[PDB]
Structures are given as structure tokens and as C-alpha cells.
Amino acid sequence: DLIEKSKKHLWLPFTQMKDYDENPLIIESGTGIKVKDINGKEYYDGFSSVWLNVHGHRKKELDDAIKKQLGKIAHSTLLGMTNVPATQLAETLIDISPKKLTRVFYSDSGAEAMEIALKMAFQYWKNIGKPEKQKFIAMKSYKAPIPYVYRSESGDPDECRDQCLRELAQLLEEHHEEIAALSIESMVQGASGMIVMPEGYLAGVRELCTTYDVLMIVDEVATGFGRTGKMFACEHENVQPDLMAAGKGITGGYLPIAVTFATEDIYKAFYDDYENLKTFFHGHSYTGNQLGCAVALENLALFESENIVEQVAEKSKKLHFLLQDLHALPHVGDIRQLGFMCGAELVRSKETKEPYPADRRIGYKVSLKMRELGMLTRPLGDVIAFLPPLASTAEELSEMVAIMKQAIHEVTSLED
Amino acid sequence: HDLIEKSKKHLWLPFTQMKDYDENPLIIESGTGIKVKDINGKEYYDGFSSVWLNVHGHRKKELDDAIKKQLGKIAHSTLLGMTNVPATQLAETLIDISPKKLTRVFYSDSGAEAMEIALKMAFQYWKNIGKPEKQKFIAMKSYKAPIPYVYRSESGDPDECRDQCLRELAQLLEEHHEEIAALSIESMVQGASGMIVMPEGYLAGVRELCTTYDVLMIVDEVATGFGRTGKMFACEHENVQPDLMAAGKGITGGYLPIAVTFATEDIYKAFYDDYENLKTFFHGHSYTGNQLGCAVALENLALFESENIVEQVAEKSKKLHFLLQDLHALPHVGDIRQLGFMCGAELVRSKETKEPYPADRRIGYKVSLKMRELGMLTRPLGDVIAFLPPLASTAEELSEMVAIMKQAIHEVTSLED
Ligand SMILES: *Cc1c(COP(=O)(O)O)cnc(C)c1O
């Protein structure tokens, strides 16, 4: 009856509370890559608690890092001063980030880190006397398209790539003098349905931004910290962001810490005598929280000593083969994967690739079937996301993929 | 030495000119009670409660234990489409201690996120119920409307100031309410603007006008929340019932980032419907309802109960007032403002010009640096020296911090004429 109480006082993020009331779920504990509910039923953490859990739950080293920091101080401010763990973590993050990035600006969430990146971009140009550069390009302000090869007319990766790059170039051509920055997810569009960008695409946008003197903001909130088989996904194409947002996996999934990385050139445009009004007057009260910073330092220590990134890249090879036989199912239209970042797009006809009408709630229905079959994930429309913890074993991966295959079949054959 | 050099090499600090940090850096290593200790071993009174969030002091044993216990279960699992135990229990406790009309808890990571969520809730509320014209908001200082600043008003009278500002609000609402979704206001004290305490009856007046003109009242309790003004929430001072209320900072006793937007049932129910009907509030964050933060918040609220912090703040605030009135007598202290443990001393170049020092003399900053050498941290708000001591501060500690502040103020300010 914590259950009937839950229905009374909560308002959950991104969720229709009527859906919640009809199918409540309350998690009590976790161990390894499984979480347990208040009835004792276990589930594989098939989405890494929304793309942030790295080493599974109750990871000893992580538990210990927080316990240790408690023994010193939980929180002191970064407003006008600093603390030991935030400073140490800043140096460590800079060691592993793309080389052009030299500064760490903390915040609480990935959304905050992105918002800061945009404000930085905007004020940067104003600070250096170019107040005309105030517009933004959001790749899906002006908007420019990212390749969606699966639903393209050519079905051709680099045709699609080149055509999208041509359209961005046109946008850049006639408005660059007015544009402060372009924002883009690194390599994989998450919320859009785990859409992996064709080779050379991200590199191409970097090139255009440099050419037309526009700051490139790269969102690594989902992709960062090993998720795609590289520490940061922009390593796949050797891209150097001007500003880079990270969060989620940074703390191994334990606590809210997020970061906006900037280059030295951006930082110095705000560095001056106070009187000169160059200061970046933004931030948050919990910025650089010791508890969160302490757990992130140990998270990173583990990446190094557990060779997590190599292990992810290795395991991703067999994972691909498991997924392709998933492709065989009558309603699996497309399989998309980069590292442990995967999605299975569901469709009513794989020949015409016509989707189900949204009102058949296929994605939701699959997620519920997987739930009863003992696995958590979150659907994106009718794309079944699969983002297993980075510590997942080959065995655990094959078990999670099997549950996906069964749920998809059991649901979609009724067409639900 | 190299910690200090590394600090200058890779950090970009919030709300701070890094050149200022570079010439006077400060790195904190630990905390005990209401004191923090830097890496050189120098100790400082936490005069601003680590920027208005520290409640019981640092390394509060019960707080530490609460987090260790929760670690033994699970650190984080999602509230996206499901929930967890600590977040569920905390929500019930929060509803019990919050204004009665507020029945729903929507978690986020920060006070800013919780205010952003309140705005989006209000906007979509009106659209959901078929009045999409209600798309603007009022921000008290979107239309802006003025809050009473009694100290440098014509009359210097609270009632007169209150009544005038309410008259301006009423006219704005009379003329534009059909286009307005919500009004946003800090509860009783404007913090960042200089710890400006609202005159008696003003907040209630705002609530009445909002109700009268069908505008949702968003009350920001991020600074005032959790005992800071000598009530659990500041809107208790005038018995006001917000439509939406933002809370953060002190919620966890100052340990961890968790935040809440409270809503009424009428608001909640406008988003509750068959999914196909498109009433859903599609916003939120990945760390919403984080177990570690919710666990420490539950123990924070337990300690509020078992030590009645709120009554103690209200009691100690009486003597604090006397100590501040003493400060008020210094040549360059123009005004003293206080509600509970939420205080500011406004510094002026002339007491009955109340002419401020030119901003470029950096008086507030200079005073804050002098307090630092004197063993006490705070942050100035322009030339207002904020004083927001942890709620657990003793009468003796309160007198000690006020004395450092007094000394710092005359020491700096006597050299500026
Ligand atoms: C602290 C504060 C905020 C912002 O909260 P953050 O956690 O720093 O993002 C909002 N409103 C008021 C009144 C505050 O004091």
C-alpha cells in the first residue's frame, strides 16, 4: 500500500499518471544490473536507469567513495571559491576529454549543461564585440536535418550524409554572420529513436562550423562515458567540440552532476577585470557538489582499471549479431547500434516500413510485456531502446536480447 | 600549491569572475558543525550556509548515516514511468508539511529546474483546459511588476509601499489577466535583490489579486523554504496557499541536489487523462527522485521534527535582531533587514542620503574578503552583506559571526571616504 499512496502524492516526469496508476512500479533495491521491486520481483536494468548506470547497482567502489567523502564534507560552494573533489575531478575530466577542451563548468543536470553551453555561446560573441551573432542552429533559431537513412529515399548513408551536409551549408552560407552556435547530439540521436549518424557526418558538421565561424555545441549527455564504445562519442570521428555537455554516466549513475566543457579561447573572453563586465553570471547552488564529484572520480578510476571502454567495444561485436537475428522478427523494421547504444524500430510492414499508428501504443505495450518478463526499458515511440549497463556480461546481454525478442513477438503478433 | 594552480587551470566557476578567483583563491577540504576548513587548515564560519542551503551544519551524523543506509539498498533508479521507495515516502512527508492545498510533488534537480517546471505547468495547464490565450507571465522584481522596497521608497512606510505596489499589480492584472497564465514571486524575502523583506500583508495581497484575476500563483521558496524565515515555509507568515511552489537548497539539509515543484490537485488533474487525449506533461530530468538525495531529505525532515528547528530559529531570531540593530548603528550601515535567519546589512556611503557607494568601489566584495581573513564566509549582494547562518547556529555562534561582520564592515568602509 506504498502503492496506493504513490498514486496520491507523486507527479512523475515524462509520464501520463493515468498510465502509472494502471500499472504501478516501485523499486526497492538493486544489485549488479538488476533492480528489485517492493514485491521482490527482479528486473534486468535494460535501459541503465535511463542511460546513466555504468557499473550496475550497489557497486562497492562507488559506495565506498561516497562514504569516504561523507567523512569530510558533503557540500561546500563553488560560487567564488572551490573544493577539493570538484578541482580534482576537473583535472581528470580534462585528461580524458577532447584535447581542445580545457575548462569544466559544473551544473546539476544534462539539461542545465546544455543550457549553459548555449548561454556561453551567446555571451561569448557579445563579450568580444560581435552582438550580431545571436542565433542558433538546432539539428533535428534555425533548424537543419540530420540523416535518417532508414527512412531515406536513397537508403544510401553518404548520399544522405552529403545531402544533409549540403542543406546545412546552405543555411550557413546565408546566415552565418547572425549565428552564434550550432547544437547537435554526438553521433547518435537518442530521444529521436537511437538514430546513428552515417560515417563522416559529424566530421562534416564540425568542418562547416569552423568554416563559417560558428561555435559547435556537442551534446554527449547520453553518449558520454563509454556508452558508444569510446570514452566520448565524438572520438569516433575525431571531432573537437567548442562546447561539450555531459551528465548521466559521469557519476556511474549514482548522483546528479553535469558538466559543460569549454575551450580556453571561450573561457578567456569572460576573463577580465570585474569592472569590464565580461563575467558569466550563471550557475547553480549545488554546482561541484562533493558527494557527486567524489563518486565521479571513482567512476573514472574504474573506467581505467576495468578497461570499460575496450570491454564495451569488444562485447558490442557479439551484441550486433544477437540484434541482427532480432531483425528477423516480422515487425522489426530496423536495428540501430553504436556500442551499447541500441534501438529496434518496430513497424507494421517491413517491406513498406509503414509504422503502426501511434494510437496502438506498440512501444508502450512492448515495454510492459518486457516488464512482466523481467526487464526494464523505455520505448521511444515504437522504437524499443536497449541501453544495457556498461558492466553487462556477454551472457546478460544475450538474456536481455532474448526477452526483447519474446516481448516484441508476443505483443506485435496480436498487432496490439 | 599545485591544487591551487590546478584549480586555476581547469575550473570555470558559477557567478564568478575567474580573475577574482585567481588573485584570491579559496579551496575547502572539510566541515565540522557551522565551520568549514580550507586546505591550509584555516577555519571559517559558514556565514551564508554554503549559499543558503546548509541547515544542521556540516557532517551532521544523522544525515551521513541516512545516506550510508540508502547506499545499502540502491543509489539511483528512475522516476520515468515508475517510482522508488525514498521518493515515494518523501513525497508524503512533503505534502504533510506544505500548505494544505498543495497535494502533488514533482521532483527535479535544482531550484531553477523547479521554477522552470512551475512555469511550464502553468502554461500547459491553461492550454490543456482550453484557454491557450493565457500564455504570458508576471515576474515580480513576461510583464514585470514591482515589489515593495521600503528602505528607498518615497514614504519609507511599509503599508503605504505595500498598498501602492499592490495597486500597480491590480491595474496590470485588470488590464491583461486574460493573457496571463501565472505570476511568479519569492516568498516574503527577495534574496538576490538584497534580502528585501516584504511588508506585512503584501504577499497575501498578491495571492488575493491572483485568485481574483484567474492567474496561477507560483511561489519561490527555494531560499526561504525549510525553516529559514522561522516558519517551515515562508508563505505561512501570511497563511498563503500557492498554486505552485518551488523548493530546493535546504530540502536535503544542504547535502545533495534535489528539488520540488509542488502543485494543487486541480492543476494535477488537468494533466490526468487517457494518453490519446494529449494532456501529459512531457518534461523532467534523468535524476528525478534520486534515492540518495531523497533519503537524506527524509532524515533532514525527521531532524526538523525531533529538534524543532523551526521554533528554535524563531526564538534565536529575537536576540539576533538586537545584534543586527547594533550593527545598524555603524556609520556606513544604512539598513538592516531580517526575517528569521534570513538577513542583510545594506551598506551606504551616506546614512540619510542613503546614497550608495559607487558600484566600482566594490565595497561588498571587499567586505566579504575582509570577513574571509577574519575567519567567516559570506557572499555580498552588491553592497548588501548577506547573513544567512545555518539553522543550527547557537546564540553564541550568532553573536560571534555578527561581531566579525561588524568589524569587517567598519574596517573596509572607513577607508573609502
Ligand atoms: C537558489 C535559488 C534559486 C535557484 O536554485 P538552484 O539550485 O541554484 O538552481 C531559485 N530561486 C531562489 C529564491 C533561490 O534562492
Ligand SMILES: *Cc1c(COP(=O)(O)O)cnc(C)c1O
Ligand atoms: C538526458 C539527456 C539530456 C538531459 O539530461 P537531464 O539530466 O535529464 O536534464 C540532454 N541531452 C541528451 C542527449 C540527453 O540524453
